[PDB]
Structures are given as structure tokens and as C-alpha cells.
Design a protein around this ligand. Structure first.
Ligand SMILES: *[C@@H]1O[C@H](CO)[C@@H](O[C@@H]2O[C@H](CO)[C@@H](O)[C@H](O)[C@H]2NC(C)=O)[C@H](O)[C@H]1NC(C)=O
Ligand SMILES: *[C@@H]1O[C@H](CO)[C@@H](O[C@@H]2O[C@H](CO)[C@@H](O)[C@H](O)[C@H]2NC(C)=O)[C@H](O)[C@H]1NC(C)=O
Ligand SMILES: *[C@@H]1O[C@H](CO)[C@@H](O[C@@H]2O[C@H](CO)[C@@H](O)[C@H](O)[C@H]2NC(C)=O)[C@H](O)[C@H]1NC(C)=O
Ligand SMILES: *[C@@H]1O[C@H](CO)[C@@H](O[C@@H]2O[C@H](CO)[C@@H](O)[C@H](O)[C@H]2NC(C)=O)[C@H](O)[C@H]1NC(C)=O
Ligand SMILES: *[C@@H]1O[C@H](CO)[C@@H](O)[C@H](O)[C@H]1NC(C)=O
Ligand SMILES: *[C@@H]1O[C@H](CO)[C@@H](O)[C@H](O)[C@H]1NC(C)=O
Ligand SMILES: *[C@@H]1O[C@H](CO)[C@@H](O)[C@H](O)[C@H]1NC(C)=O
Ligand SMILES: *[C@@H]1O[C@H](CO)[C@@H](O)[C@H](O)[C@H]1NC(C)=O
Ligand SMILES: *[C@@H]1O[C@H](CO)[C@@H](O)[C@H](O)[C@H]1NC(C)=O
Ligand SMILES: *[C@@H]1O[C@H](CO)[C@@H](O)[C@H](O)[C@H]1NC(C)=O
Lengths: 135, 405, 99, 99, 50
């Protein structure tokens, strides 16, 4: 209405504004952030690592990596074989496979990772060997 | 009255539910984004308080990790995923409501769907659970299909096979009722069972307040978060609740006084939230242990504990998944239609007391009989079902009769 | 100063009524009243069942019925005195008040 | 020894006891009266702390409500108030000390 | 007050843990005879009285 300038949300924080000259309504949303996790086999076995960015889509990760992002501990994404999209977040540095095994390093919603020349693979965990007793 | 007894003549099959919470939501809280934000001065001041955040991070990590040991302990009771045969005939017992339905996409049972439809920034995120809801379903289906075609055998070694009516005969024999009672009523009991399951469905349609226990486990989270994210708009005795405004109106040497009050208030709020979470997690684990025990002793075997796996003598149970918990369907045995008789604890004959093998002596007014203790079935007295053990001049209440051969 | 104490929902007479109901159901019915309708049975027969439940045949009770009853009464007699002499007998409940 | 066994020829009936706490005292607290008293000046300062008092009331109310479910769960086990028979002869046993 | 309320919460948890055991001794010792060793007394259980 012609007499409000600021705005608020279901809490007490400004999330809109009116430009003093070009009298237009503008939204406000903050820039992305979240946790970071490192997935590694023991230093006794191997020395490679994989990285998980929690709660983002992979395109916003790739764009920011091409322009600007904190934690400059950058990994190399060779092809689509590196970037992978889980429910938890983008998984950079692991190749998704087609088989099923036991869970070794739990990651997210049914996804587990393991060290199988050698590299790091992420798959879908298996609940056990199928069986059917002959009633 | 000191010489009269009552013995039932007709039974009943009933099904009663029971709901238990198992796990709660996983959360992770980041200090510097909550307390401070992007301001460097706030973090440089927060470094003077020691390690008040590593402890919080460790405690919440411990709670989150524990939340997945609660589900791995209730459902992961088996190492094989059993199936059910294509021919869905089990002597007349009808399991269509509990077994999975392949037509729908998520492969849940109708009761499971009904259950699923009845239950509803600043560094405050939620982690997803490890086991998706389409895996809990597979565990539940394997548990259900191992107890139909094997009985209790699959919980103590290799799963051995046996037809269903023979299993139910075993389970009647396990509560003091002979086998034949089932075989002469096999149809009736089957129908007696089939309707009970149906009632369950309606008992969850009309009543909305059935699943409060799970619902609370959800509600108690939201409040606990809401309050936290509201506590960010309190001055705590300072001049404003926004760090940027203070940093844009006061000389930095004069601003530590204002920033300190905010820092202390926010630390206090975080500590309160963490402690409440710790206590609630303790309660949830206490419940999950009982859920695991009930899975082990009512589903994988028949229980002799009173009022543990249902009200009445116990027959079996069936698990069904649910959001953040589990639901059990206990199948019990309730006597009915009692009839009165006159009794006495011995039968004198040829100067020898006579006591039954198992059963109680019963009179119908003129004749004497010995019958089992839970379902009226009289028999002609005979030395085959009595033992002598003593003389006739000691026992009290003994009634003299004849015993054939 | 601002602190109040609330009364329990159930009075003491109601709790005594529940206690008496439970006591009267386990004398004339045994354990049958805990699974359906309450079925009556004379008390010595119930005790014979409860001997049969620990691997001792029924006759042992009948040939000793007069003796066993005595051994019960003496026991039930002594408990009262055992609730006088021992000071810490009610150690638990007392603390609930004190704490 | 590998060929010798012992078997008892007489028994004993004994009565023990056991005490278990069930519930504790319910309370409730009014913040403003306890902290600031009846001062109008103090309450304005206290109001700057947000919701440190709704939490406390909620916690105490939860405890108080649970203290009734405990007693309801222990004692309300049956839904028919059975009455003891008038004449008290049960084969030679008193129950007079418990009835 | 915060100290008092936390103490009360912990004691309430303890009391609930103790009150979930009377509810079981009332079902397996009072409503029926038990087979768990040393549950309803020291010996071979016969019956119980609240
Ligand atoms: C035991 O109870 C069952 C439960 O009702 C009785 O079954 C009914 O019997 C009547 C006549 O006997 C039939 O008209 C009904 O159709 C039966 N019900 C069902 C669901 O089939 C049974 O008759 C009783 N038996 C005895 C011996 O009392
Ligand atoms: C087991 O119970 C189900 C549930 O009622 C039965 O399925 C019904 O089948 C009839 C006949 O096709 C349909 O008219 C009903 O609509 C079905 N019910 C539902 C809920 O879809 C099933 O027939 C029973 N099992 C057997 C072997 O008859
Ligand atoms: C089993 O023990 C009881 C109790 O010690 C014995 O009963 C006693 O028997 C003596 C024998 O003369 C009497 O003097 C006592 O008065 C009895 N005690 C009571 C409390 O009445 C009983 O005799 C023992 N069993 C056997 C077979 O000897
Ligand atoms: C239960 O045992 C008690 C203990 O002897 C009996 O109570 C006594 O009864 C007599 C006569 O009735 C009185 O002279 C005593 O004073 C009573 N003793 C006490 C401590 O009160 C009681 O009679 C027995 N039960 C029955 C049904 O007779
Ligand atoms: C994928 O990224 C787009 C933006 O390019 C976003 O709108 C979408 O939500 C992301 N996908 C998921 C599943 O979040
Ligand atoms: C592996 O490839 C097969 C063939 O397309 C596919 O059906 C299967 O889902 C794949 N495994 C995955 C995606 O985990
Ligand atoms: C107990 O039974 C006897 C029969 O042996 C009878 O004489 C007596 O009256 C009964 N007891 C009572 C209290 O009626
Ligand atoms: C026992 O018989 C009496 C009358 O003879 C009757 O009132 C009572 O109902 C009978 N008992 C039962 C359990 O029906
Ligand atoms: C008792 O059972 C016998 C067995 O046939 C029967 O002849 C008699 O009439 C019955 N008595 C009564 C009172 O019904
Ligand atoms: C055990 O049995 C052997 C016979 O094989 C016998 O020589 C030995 O004395 C027995 N043990 C005892 C303690 O008597």
C-alpha cells in the first residue's frame, strides 16, 4: 500500500525494500551456504578424497566455482563422472555405479561410498541377499 | 463359593494396535552463522569464550549419529529378504491388507498408506535419514513373509517351512488348548480372523486422535526450533538486535559493550536448546529399546508375559511401518460364554484318591467328568487320565465315584 | 513467592478402591480376570494350579493343606513388625518427599 | 561327584516386600512475581529477554501432566470394580491384614 | 530458575523410569504367575499382593 516501505516475514527480519527513486518493490534473499564433509579412506590404504556440499544443486556449485566461492580447496571435475546429485547435496569426486554392495561409508538417503585402477565410487546400499522359501 | 467353578464354552479372536516412537529428526546448528553472522568483529570477540561451540557441535553430532542406530536395531533383525509365493492361499486366512500391493508405485500395503496419510535462514538445517522409506518397507515385508511361511523358526537358524493351519495349531497348543479345537473350527476361526482385520481399517478412518504419540514427536521439534529462531530478535539489554546497525552507528572501541550482551544471550539460548534435545533423545532411545524387544519377542516368537504383546492370551503379531515409529497388530485369544458347574478336587475309589493328569473335575448335576481348563470338553473318567498318589482319608472335599477301565 | 503446589487428580480413596478391586479379583478368580471375564474357582484349587506351575504335582498341597496355611499366616503376621524395626524400610518413598 | 545327587524333602513359604516410587510432587511457577515482585519498573526490563518464561512454564506443565499418567498407568489396570464376598473363609488363610 | 527446572526434568525422567517398572510388576506378578528368575521375589514365585 502507498504507505509501507519495509517488509518482514514470519519472523522479525527485513525481506523487501522500496528504492527511493525508482519506486519499485524488491525482494531480498541471502547468498547460498551450508556444510562441507570430506569422504576418505584411511591414510593407510589410499590418499584420495571426495567432497560433499550439503543442500545445494550442482549448477550453483559449478557457477560459483567458475567465478567465486570460499573454501578454495578446489577439486577437479574431469567429466560428468565426478559431479553427482544426491538428496543430501552435490558429490564431487566420485563415480556412481550400477551394482549393489554393503554400506561402507554412509552418505545420505540410501547412498553409500567405498574404495574399489582403484578409485572412489558411490552407489545404492543393498539390504541383503534375496531369498524365497517354497511354501 | 468354595465348591463351584466357571468354565468358558466359546472363544473369540481380537486384534488390538499399539504405537511406539522410534526416532526423531536430525539437526545440525552452526554457531558463527547463528550468533554472529558475517561480521568479523563478532567472531573475533567470540574467540575469547574458549570452546563453547566444539562441545555443542559434538553433542548434536552424537545425537544425529545415534538416531540411525535406533532404526538399524528395530527393523534390521534379519539377514535375508524373503518373498511371498504367488499363490496367496493360506487355509482361508486373508492377509491382503498387510502384504504389499505391487500396483501402486511405492509398494506399500493399504494399511501403511492409511497410516502415512494420517500424520503431518540462520544455520538451522536438517539432515536426511540414512534409510529411505522404501527400504523400511522391504524390511517390514521380509519380516511379514518370514513369519507366514515359517512360523518362529526363521528367528533361530535356517527358515523351515510349514503350512499355516499347522502353525496356528502349534500356537493354540502353546497356551493350553489342544490341537483338535482348531481343526474342527478351522473355517469359523478363519472368518473370525478375517473380519477383525477389517475393523482395524475403520478404527483408523474415523478416529483422528489415534496417532498422537507420533504426532507429538513431530510437534516438539517445531516449537524447539521456532523459539530458537525467534530468540534472534531480542535486545538482551543492548540498543538493537542487528549487528550491522550497531557497527554502523558506534565507534568500535565503544561497541564491544553492546555486542557482549547479544553474544551472552545467544549462547545461553543455544545451551538451553542443546540440553533439552539431550533429554528428549534419552527418552526416545528408552522407547526404541522397548520397540526392539517387542519385535524380538512378539513377532519372532510367542510370549508368555501377561499384557506384554496384547490383552489376552497371545497368538502372534505383525509389524507395520509408520513415520518416525512402528505399529504392532497383536492377535490374542479371549474366552467367552462361561457356564457354571460344581467341582471337587478328588475322586475316591476303592480307598484311593484320584487326581487328574491335566484338567479339573466337573459335575453337571448327576454325572462326573474331567475337562481341560479353558474350553469345555468333558470326558469319561478313566485311569488313563488320572493318577492315584495316596489314600482317601486325608484330602478334603473328595467326592466318591467310580473310574472305568 | 509465586510458587504453587497442585493436587493429584486421583485422591487416596480412589487409589484404595483400585487396590481393593485388584485384591478381590485375585482371590476368587486367580489370573483369569486379567484376560477376559472373571471366572470363579475355590482358593485351594487355585493354589494347586500354582504348585503345578513350578514343577510340583497337585497332591503335595492337598496332603499338606492344613500345614501350609499356617506357614502363610505367620509370615503375613511378621511383616507388620518388620515395617517397624527396620528404619530404612521406607527409605525410598521418604526421599521423594525430602528431595 | 559324578554319581551323587541331592533332593529336598520339605519346603518353606516365605513373604518378602518391595517398595517402588511412582510419582512426585507437582508444582508451577509464576515468573514475574518471583523475579520482579510487584514492581512495575522491573517487568519492563525483564520483558527484553523474550521467551525465557514460556519455556519454563511449558516444561513444568509437561512434568505435571506426566505425573498423572504415571499413576493412571500403574493402578487403572481393570475396568470392573470387584467387591469382596461378605463371608471370609478361604480354606484357612487370613487376608484380614490386606483387605 | 533455570537450574531448578533442569534438575526437575532429570528427576522426572528418573521417576518415569521407575514407574514403568511397577506397571510391569503389576501385570506379571499380580495378574499372573511369572517365570523370570528373581523378578517377583527370591524363590519360585507363587503370587503377589499390591
Ligand atoms: C461361538 O461364538 C460364535 C461367534 O458368534 C458363534 O458363531 C455364530 O453362530 C451363530 C449360530 O450358532 C451363527 O448364526 C452366526 O453366523 C455365527 N457367527 C459367525 C461370524 O459365523 C458360534 O455359534 C458360537 N458357538 C457356540 C458353541 O456357542
Ligand atoms: C481379502 O480381502 C480383500 C479386501 O476386501 C478382498 O478384496 C476384495 O475383493 C472383492 C472381490 O473382487 C472386491 O469387490 C473388493 O472391493 C475387494 N476389497 C478391496 C478392499 O479392494 C479379497 O477378495 C480377500 N481375499 C480373497 C481370497 O477373497
Ligand atoms: C517340614 O517342616 C515343618 C516345619 O519345621 C515340620 O513341621 C513341624 O513338625 C514338628 C514335628 O513334631 C512339630 O513339632 C512342629 O510343630 C511342626 N511345625 C509347625 C510349624 O507346625 C514338618 O514336620 C516337616 N516335614 C516333615 C516330613 O518332617
Ligand atoms: C487371623 O489371625 C488373627 C491372629 O490371631 C486372628 O485375629 C485374632 O482373633 C481373635 C478372635 O477373633 C482375637 O481375640 C485376637 O485379638 C485377634 N488378633 C488380632 C491381632 O487382632 C483372626 O481371627 C484370624 N482370622 C480369622 C478369620 O479368624
Ligand atoms: C537444481 O537447480 C535449480 C536451479 O538451476 C533449482 O531451481 C532446483 O531446485 C535444483 N534442484 C533441486 C532438486 O533442488
Ligand atoms: C545401472 O544401469 C541399468 C541399465 O540402465 C539401470 O536400470 C540401473 O538403474 C543403473 N543403476 C543405478 C542407476 O544405480
Ligand atoms: C466350604 O465347603 C464346605 C463343604 O465341605 C461347607 O460345609 C462350608 O459351608 C463351605 N464354606 C462356607 C464358608 O460356606
Ligand atoms: C453359578 O451359578 C449361579 C446360580 O446357580 C449363577 O447365578 C451364576 O451366574 C453361575 N456362575 C456363572 C459364572 O455364570
Ligand atoms: C448330565 O450329563 C448326562 C450325560 O448324558 C445327561 O444324561 C444328564 O441329563 C445331564 N444332567 C443334567 C442335569 O442335564
Ligand atoms: C567319576 O567316575 C569315574 C569312573 O569313570 C570314577 O573312577 C571317579 O571316582 C568318579 N569321580 C568321583 C569324584 O567319584
Amino acid at each position: 500500500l502507498p504507505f509501507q516501505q519495509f517488509g518482514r516475514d514470519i519472523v522479525d527480519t527485513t525481506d523487501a525494500v522500496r528504492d527511493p527513486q525508482t519506486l519499485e518493490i524488491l525482494d531480498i534473499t541471502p547468498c547460498s551456504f551450508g556444510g562441507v564433509s570430506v569422504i576418505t579412506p584411511g591414510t593407510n590404504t589410499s590418499n584420495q578424497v571426495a567432497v560433499l556440499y550439503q543442500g545445494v544443486n550442482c549448477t550453483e556449485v559449478s557457477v560459483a566455482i567458475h567465478a567465486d566461492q570460499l573454501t578454495p580447496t578446489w577439486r577437479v571435475y574431469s567429466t560428468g563422472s565426478n559431479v553427482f546429485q544426491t538428496r543430501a547435496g552435490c558429490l564431487i569426486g566420485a563415480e556412481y555405479v550400477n551394482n549393489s554392495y554393503e554400506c561402507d561409508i554412509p552418505i545420505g538417503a540410501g547412498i553409500c561410498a567405498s574404495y574399489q585402477s582403484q578409485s572412489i565410487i558411490a552407489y545404492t546400499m543393498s539390504l541383503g541377499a534375496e531369498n524365497s522359501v517354497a511354501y | 463359593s468354595n465348591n463351584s467353578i466357571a468354565i468358558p464354552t466359546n472363544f473369540t479372536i481380537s486384534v488390538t494396535t499399539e504405537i511406539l516412537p522410534v526416532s526423531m529428526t536430525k539437526t545440525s546448528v552452526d554457531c558463527t552463522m547463528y550468533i554472529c553472522g558475517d561480521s568479523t568483529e563478532c567472531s573475533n570477540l567470540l574467540l575469547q569464550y574458549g570452546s563453547f561451540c566444539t562441545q555443542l557441535k559434538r553433542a548434536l553430532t552424537g545425537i544425529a549419529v545415534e538416531q540411525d542406530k535406533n532404526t538399524q536395531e528395530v527393523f534390521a533383525q534379519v539377514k535375508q529378504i524373503y518373498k511371498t509365493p504367488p499363490i496367496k492361499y493360506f487355509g482361508g486366512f486373508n492377509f491382503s491388507q498387510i502384504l504389499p500391493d505391487p500396483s501402486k508405485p511405492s509398494k506399500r500395503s493399504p494399511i501403511e498408506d492409511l497410516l502415512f496419510n494420517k500424520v503431518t535462514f540462520n544455520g538451522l538445517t536438517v539432515l536426511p535419514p540414512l534409510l529411505t522409506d522404501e527400504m523400511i518397507a522391504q524390511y517390514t515385508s521380509a519380516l511379514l513373509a518370514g513369519t507366514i511361511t515359517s512360523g518362529w523358526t526363521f528367528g533361530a537358524g535356517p527358515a523351515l517351512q510349514i503350512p499355516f493351519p499347522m502353525q496356528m495349531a502349534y500356537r493354540f497348543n502353546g497356551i493350553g488348548v489342544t490341537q483338535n479345537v482348531l481343526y474342527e473350527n478351522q473355517k469359523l476361526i478363519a472368518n473370525q480372523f478375517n473380519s477383525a482385520i477389517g475393523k482395524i481399517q475403520d478404527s483408523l478412518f474415523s478416529t483422528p486422535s489415534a496417532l498422537g504419540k507420533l504426532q507429538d514427536v513431530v510437534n516438539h521439534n517445531a516449537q524447539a526450533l521456532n523459539t530458537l529462531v525467534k530468540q534472534l530478535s531480542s535486545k538482551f539489554g543492548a540498543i538493537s538486535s542487528v549487528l550491522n546497525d550497531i557497527l554502523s552507528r558506534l565507534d568500535p572501541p565503544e561497541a564491544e559493550v553492546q555486542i557482549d550482551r547479544l553474544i551472552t544471550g545467544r549462547l545461553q539460548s543455544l545451551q538451553t536448546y542443546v540440553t533439552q534435545q539431550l533429554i528428549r533423545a534419552a527418552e526416545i532411545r528408552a522407547s526404541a529399546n522397548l520397540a526392539a524387544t517387542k519385535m524380538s519377542e512378539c513377532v519372532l516368537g510367542q510370549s508368555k508375559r501377561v499384557d506384554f504383546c496384547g490383552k489376552g492370551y497371545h497368538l502372534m503379531s505383525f509389524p507395520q511401518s509408520a513415520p518416525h515409529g512402528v505399529v504392532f497388530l497383536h492377535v490374542t485369544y479371549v474366552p467367552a460364554q462361561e457356564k457354571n458347574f460344581t467341582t471337587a478336587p478328588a475322586i475316591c475309589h476303592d480307598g484311593k484318591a484320584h487326581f487328574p493328569r491335566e484338567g479339573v473335575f466337573v459335575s453337571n448335576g448327576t454325572h462326573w467328568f474331567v475337562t481341560q481348563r479353558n474350553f469345555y470338553e468333558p470326558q469319561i473318567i478313566t485311569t488313563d487320565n488320572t493318577f492315584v498318589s495316596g489314600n482317601c482319608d486325608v484330602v478334603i472335599g473328595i467326592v466318591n465315584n467310580t473310574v472305568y477301565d
